[PDB]
């Protein structure tokens, strides 16, 4: 299934470092966002986001 | 046909493997 389209992508070395670092940055950003979202939605009421509405009349 | 001291490489080659040897002299050796 590993066609020439995917085979060609495994030969660049001078430029691959920059794009791999950018991909690592994007992955860490999305991972941080996902973990923050899961920590948010695993606990409701205790957190300070909804106490504003709880005290609201 | 009327062999004598028939103990050749095939005799001890048979025990190790059988499918790898290409089925074209299996009939010869069994005969």
């Amino acid at each position: 299934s590993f066609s020439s389209l995917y085979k060609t992508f495994f030969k660049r070395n001078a430029v691959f470092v920059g794009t791999i670092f950018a991909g690592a940055f994007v992955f860490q950003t999305v991972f941080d966002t996902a973990i923050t979202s899961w920590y948010e939605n695993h606990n409701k009421g205790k957190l300070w986001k909804d106490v504003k509405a709880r005290i609201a009349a | 046909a009327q062999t004598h001291a028939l103990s050749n490489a095939a005799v001890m080659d048979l025990q190790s493997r059988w499918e790898n040897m290409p089925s074209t002299e299996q009939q010869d050796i069994v005969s």
Binding site: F2, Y6, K7, F10, I20, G23, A24, F25, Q28 | -
Partner: protein
């Protein structure tokens, strides 16, 4: 047995491909490992 009679290694040998199958897998994993190490270091 002489040196030419190589001992059997079938216990760990895999499908008779010996091509980019293993190479691409290993390279992709180490690329991911570099990704994670770089992210942690940053």
């Amino acid at each position: 047995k002489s040196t030419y009679r190589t001992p059997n290694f079938d216990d760990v040998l895999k499908e008779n491909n010996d091509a980019d199958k293993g190479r691409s897998y290993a390279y992709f994993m180490v690329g991911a490992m570099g990704l994670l190490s770089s992210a942690g270091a940053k």
